């Protein structure tokens, strides 16, 4: 069931914008409320163009199928605001509102740019639950990073940004499209630039999760002082990245070791990763979520 952009309607009497909460080369994100019920939504606004059509449809088709999982921000619907002949129309994407912002932002606003280890373990576990849902449905995210992990005002964790995700049709199937964000890309995805035979699968998302854990621990991905072109040369050649400080637990160090195995056929699968002690053993979840929520509110 593929979306047909021509059938989308003007949102005239259904939602109203409230405040602008984000902006980038993609468009704008707004806080919005349903005018009839008052319920809260985020609304992403992009103007329409044939040139960005394929990614738009992939985002909407992926969200409609999978966003009902509690670790994926929920899709509510879409509209197209109709503007006069000289002016582009705009697509509105109506989503579950994630009021705490991104993990990248959380790190930026923290003293030393380093989260507490128990916070990192909780966030990583929530990301893996989302990945598990996706991988079991033959989906590869392909752009896992702190900018695409959001937090609600109650410290729930939600994955976003499905525009370059891959939908396979067989379990064993593989992909070869050279796509991602450089510092978080897996060595077997990078290899597709110069190697027209290379392939990757769902384990490339697990590499990116490893880089995102390092992002949370140290404030940036590895090689953040290299130009992107040099990072892309060094990721397949350097040994796998490690945490700089010996103060982290052996558990955390072991988990980073499991995500960042360079040989992807020897990298553990999502299910095995879910059983790692760093992820599996969190008996103080209630306390951790409270501390995260309070830290989030402290940082404004």
């Amino acid at each position: 069931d593929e979306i047909d952009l021509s059938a989308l309607r003007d949102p005239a009497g259904i939602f109203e914008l409230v405040e602008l909460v984000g902006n980038g080369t993609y468009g704008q994100v707004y806080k919005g409320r349903h005018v009839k019920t008052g319920q809260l939504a985020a609304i992403k606004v992009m103007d329409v163009t044939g040139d960005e059509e394929e990614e738009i449809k992939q985002e909407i088709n992926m969200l409609k199928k999978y966003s009902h999982h509690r670790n994926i921000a929920t899709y509510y619907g879409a509209f197209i605001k109709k503007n006069p002949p000289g002016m582009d129309d705009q697509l509105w994407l109506v989503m579950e509102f994630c009021g705490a912002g991104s993990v990248t932002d959380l790190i930026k606003n923290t003293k030393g740019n380093t989260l507490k280890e128990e916070w990192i373990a909780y966030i990583c576990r929530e990301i893996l639950r989302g990945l598990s849902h996706l991988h079991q449905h033959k989906v590869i995210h392909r752009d896992i990073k702190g900018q695409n992990v959001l937090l609600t005002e109650n410290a729930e964790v939600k994955l976003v940004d499905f525009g370059v995700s891959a939908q396979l049709d067989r379990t064993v199937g593989r992909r070869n499209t050279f796509i991602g964000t450089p510092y978080w890309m897996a060595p077997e995805v990078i290899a597709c630039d110069e190697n027209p035979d290379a392939t990757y699968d769902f384990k490339s998302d697990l590499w990116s999760l490893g880089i995102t854990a390092i992002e949370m621990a140290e404030g940036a991905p590895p090689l953040c002082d290299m130009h992107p072109m040099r990072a892309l040369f060094l990721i397949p050649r350097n040994p796998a990245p490690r945490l700089k400080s010996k103060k982290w637990s052996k558990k955390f160090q072991s988990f980073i070791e499991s995500c960042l195995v360079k040989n992807h056929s020897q990298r553990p699968a999502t299910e095995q990763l879910m059983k790692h002690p760093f992820i599996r053993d969190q008996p103080n979840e209630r306390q951790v979520r409270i501390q995260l929520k309070d830290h989030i509110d402290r940082t404004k």
């Binding site: 900018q147 050279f178 964000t181 510092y183 940036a220 290299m226 130009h227 992107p228």
Partner: peptide, 17 residues
């Protein structure tokens, strides 16, 4: 990078140099 685009990849997201 922040803004660096290489072929079909997203923006660098982390850097420049």
């Amino acid at each position: 990078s922040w803004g660096f685009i290489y072929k079909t990849l997203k923006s660098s997201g982390s850097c420049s140099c």
